[PDB]
Amino acid sequence: FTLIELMIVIAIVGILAAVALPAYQDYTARAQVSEAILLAEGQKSAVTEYYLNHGEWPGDNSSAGVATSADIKGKYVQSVTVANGVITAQMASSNVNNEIKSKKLSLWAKRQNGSVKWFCGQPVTRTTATATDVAAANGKTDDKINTKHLPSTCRDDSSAS
Amino acid sequence: FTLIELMIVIAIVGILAAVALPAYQDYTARAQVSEAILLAEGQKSAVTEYYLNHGEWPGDNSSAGVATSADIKGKYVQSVTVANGVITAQMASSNVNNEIKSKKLSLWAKRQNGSVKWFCGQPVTRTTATATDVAAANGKTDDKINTKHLPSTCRDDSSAS
Amino acid sequence: GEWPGDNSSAGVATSADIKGKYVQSVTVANGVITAQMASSNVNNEIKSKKLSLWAKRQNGSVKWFCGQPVTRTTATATDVAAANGKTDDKINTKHLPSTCRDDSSAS
Amino acid sequence: FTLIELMIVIAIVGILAAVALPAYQDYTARAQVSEAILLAEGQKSAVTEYYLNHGEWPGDNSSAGVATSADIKGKYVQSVTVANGVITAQMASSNVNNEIKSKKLSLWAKRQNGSVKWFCGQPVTRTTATATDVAAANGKTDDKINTKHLPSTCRDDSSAS
């Protein structure tokens, strides 16, 4: 009945190759998400510049005069969009974490002691291109990204100022 | 007693998920610190200009006529200050490396073959707005930042000339 | 262009700095870094043992080496010296895995 | 023999912390180099002015009447020199990329449809202060800087006209 001991070793192996893997489709997502974060970053400039020139954020890419929603893109990026200076990009719809598939988070800068502070966080939009305060246009959170599937920092709401 | 071998694999896992992570609260700090570095940089201009116009550094932001201590700020920046042309900003007091929480380092330019050379390094202050030589006003090193928690370069003392 | 003679040359966590389980020292030697086994709850054998970490400059930048406690001739240099500590801290290549079997000579 | 799998993970870590870092002593150099580029720029004016006034470049700083070789300097700059209007500065001899340690590249403007075009590139010198064409005085390329360790643009030879 070392066989048991064997079948034990079998048994413990039996229930050892199942459900012993947390959150990795969760984890890949973050980077897979974060890949999307990497792109619209540059848009912030003319967005600022537009705000810099004018004092008002650009209502969008085109207000800024820059690459629109369906513009600048690639892997994990099926849109890149500005909203009254609030910039946003979307996850791809495949080869992703099945979860984060096609998700976004906005990028909104509200004026500081310094110039302004952006925010890597939830899909939101600025009340006006003129304003700095932005609105949590949540898109029923689909594009919104799990703060879990987000890293610790990039967990911002429109409220972020 | 493959169970041992198992419990070994357990055991080696046992003492594998503890203390195997150096210095990352240390590392984040650097950037979290370095974020603070990013801001007072612009102040150097009028500071120079003040020194440029006058031949004397500005005793501070206000001597220069520029954004004071509690002026220009944001994340990881709970002050930004000039001291006889020596400029300094402080770490935030939260969401930081618990270590570097609320820390500074000065920025002091002393006149060159060229114009002058600044220094990213420890909270210090210039002897006079007129001078270039600066004093290692150390604030008991709290605001002073760990050269470890600093990157290799930004390791300057008032002595830096 | 020179390695740090140690943690402090680098300005970083010294020998008795960064540590925990199975780590009773962590030390740099002219850019050659080393840590020691604990002195208990270990393999009674490997109890209190080390192996250095030395990078010598490449076609690429440089290549480190997980292997025996050694030290770099100079902080300036890349070549490192097999400061062997009478092999106590040195670790059995058997009690080491196949890869982490490097001597100062490793370049 | 998950131990193997372990020692594998060890092994792959074994040969993972060695030689997996290209060209960064190469990269720092560029900026460390480029720092040196930043300085002699202003010399171009009186150099031009000398050429502007006269029609001839200044044989040097002193011909122009400006800050000589061992003049204007600082970090990564252990000389700044003009050569018949061709200006040049040298890398420091420490705290640098051990490679680029003490290296130069000239700065030579040759007359255009417009006025003239300078060139950020290899240590060279102008045939005459009167001329525009410059000579690839190469100093056995030590001061000359690796086009790799240079950025893409600043890759000019005396021939650059």
Numbering used by the authors:
A (entry chain C), B (entry chain B), D (entry chain A): 1 to 161
C (entry chain E): 55 to 161
Question: Can you list sentences taken from the study reporting this PDB entry?
Answer:
In the bloodstream an unusually tight interaction between the bacteria and the brain microvasculature endothelial cells is established, leading to cortical plaque formation that results in opening of the blood brain barrier and bacterial invasion of the brain. This interaction is mediated by Type IV pili (T4P), long thin polymers of pilin proteins that interact with two endothelial cell receptors, CD147 and the β2 adrenergic receptor (β2AR). The interaction with CD147 is responsible for bacterial adhesion and the interaction with the β2AR induces signalling in endothelial cells. N. meningitidis PilE (Nm PilE) is 78% identical to Ng PilE and 100% identical in α1. Here we report the 1.44 Å X-ray crystal structure of Nm PilE and a cryoEM reconstruction of the Nm pilus at higher resolution, ∼6 Å, than any T4P structure reported previously.
The Iterative Helical Real Space Reconstruction (IHRSR)41 approach was used to obtain the reconstruction, which after sorting converged to a rise of 10.3 Å and a rotation of 100.8° for the subset of segments used. The cryoEM map, with an estimated resolution of ∼6 Å, shows well-defined density for the PilE globular domain, with a central depression and a protruding ridge on one side. Rod-like density is present in the core of the filament consistent with the protruding N-terminal α-helical segments of PilE, α1N. This density shows that the α1N segments are staggered in a helical array in the filament core and partially tilted relative to the filament axis, with their N termini close to the centre of the filament and their C termini lying at a larger radius. Thus, we built a model for the Nm T4P by separately fitting the Nm ΔN-PilE structure (residues 29–161) and α1N from the full-length Ng PilE structure, separated into two segments, α1:1–14 and α1:24–28, into the cryoEM map. These α-helical segments were then joined by an extended non-helical segment, α1:15–23. The ridge of density located on one side of the globular domain is occupied by the hypervariable segment of the D-region, the β-hairpin loop, β6 and the loop following β6, with Lys140 prominently displayed at its most protruding point. In our Nm T4P model the α1 segment 24–53 is curved but runs roughly parallel to the filament axis while α1:1-14 is tilted with its N terminus oriented toward the centre of the filament. This orientation places the side chain of Glu5 in close proximity (<5 Å) to the N-terminal amine of Phe1 (Phe1:N) on the neighbouring α1 in the 1-start helix, consistent with a salt bridge, which matches perfectly the well-defined channel connecting the rod-like densities at their termini. The cryoEM map shows that α1 is non-helical between the helix-breaking residues Gly14 and Pro22. The new Nm T4P model with its non-helical α1 segment provides a molecular basis with which to understand the reversible force-dependent polymorphism observed for both Nm and Ng T4P2932.
